[PDB]
Design a protein around this ligand. Sequence first.
Ligand code: HEM
Ligand SMILES: CC1(C)[C@@H]2CC[C@@]1(C)C(=O)C2
Ligand SMILES: [K+]
Length: 405
Amino acid sequence: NLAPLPPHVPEHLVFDFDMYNPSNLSAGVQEAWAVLQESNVPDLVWTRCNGGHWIATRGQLIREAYEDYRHFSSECPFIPREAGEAYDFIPTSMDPPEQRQFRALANQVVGMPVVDKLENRIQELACSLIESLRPQGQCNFTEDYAEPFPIRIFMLLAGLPEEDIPHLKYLTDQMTRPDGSMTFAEAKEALYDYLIPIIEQRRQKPGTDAISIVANGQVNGRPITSDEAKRMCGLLLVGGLDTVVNFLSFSMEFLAKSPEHRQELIERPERIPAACEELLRRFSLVADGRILTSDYEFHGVQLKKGDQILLPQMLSGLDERENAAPMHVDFSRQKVSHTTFGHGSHLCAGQHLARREIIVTLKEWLTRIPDFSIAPGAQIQHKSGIVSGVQALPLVWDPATTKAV
Ligand code: HEM
Ligand SMILES: CC1(C)[C@@H]2CC[C@@]1(C)C(=O)C2
Ligand SMILES: [K+]
């Protein structure tokens, strides 16, 4: 379904990419998005899919647009417009200077100091999960580890009951990769309906959990409001439930298929943090955007006030102008350039948590299950959206070749 071309959009800039179902998805979702970087596609294009919006395809343009909040506002950051309009999460729906007091609170709850405190718990949950799985010689990685590991950590941090995960996880996914069963707004309001009473409970009798801390936070010489607390906690949930979860699967699918890269990390565990960064570049997975606050000419293209522009975080590290042989995974890549965690004032507040979760997974998995592969003949299917994902990841291994810790 192609929305008719706006008058200011030249025909030669039309490239009808569908971010929710790209044509070459079978090849892998990063491969599919990478068609935007083939020689036939201009650096900045208009797609008529999903209501009609711009797409920047190059690292340099993506970075520039993310720095320039004056022209490119976060107020409406999702495609389609209906989602972007309904999107009211804090701090990401705000531009500076208003954004700044809230970002600092968010940093306080999921930032590095909190990760440092959680190190042992992170280690423990990973080891316990992996030790439980090891004697099986098989798992569906997405549901047996990729989901429970970072989600149980977040749920613990947020002080929310684990029994609520299936319901909460379902709703989160409707905001990033919708079933078609709910609109973005329904899912958001459902999440909000869950949060509202808890936030009230924790303003009256605060705890030490992340939600108590947000709800009782100080921003700008005043306490956060109940509704502001609600909008920040909703975003923290989504970050906790639908980011690392998907990334781990892209990484493990790759490792399962490439024993040499596994052996590299097994024999040289000191290369794991470097590997994690390269994996973050190659299997980048997030794409949101901004909305034009005024008419603006950007790299020779006129944008009209109210135009939406998708600025795919995924695309920067896959840009050959940024990394030679971008689809090639090289753990000793001299300069790993990417914007997987974003760019400008909205750069991911949870990046340290993500990195810790990844590096711990890489270390403890390869230690206990050094040798594994994708199940015989099984076809790996990726899913595309605001955050991309892996639908299923069946793995098999000989437990004899596995090592108990
Ligand atoms: C590999 C994992 C992750 C990736 C790739 C990722 C990606 C991103 C990106 C691209 C942005 C900026 C979006 C924009 O500019 O519109 C962002 C922001 C944010 N992320 Fe992450 N994220 C990850 C993990 C997490 C985790 C685990 C949390 C923990 C709750 C989290 C919490 C947040 C928050 C609160 C923001 C908003 C910061 C602001 O608006 O100032 N993220 N993330
Ligand atoms: C784009 C994101 C990855 C970032 C954290 C969750 C997410 C979906 C957002 O709405 C902000
Ligand atoms: K909005």
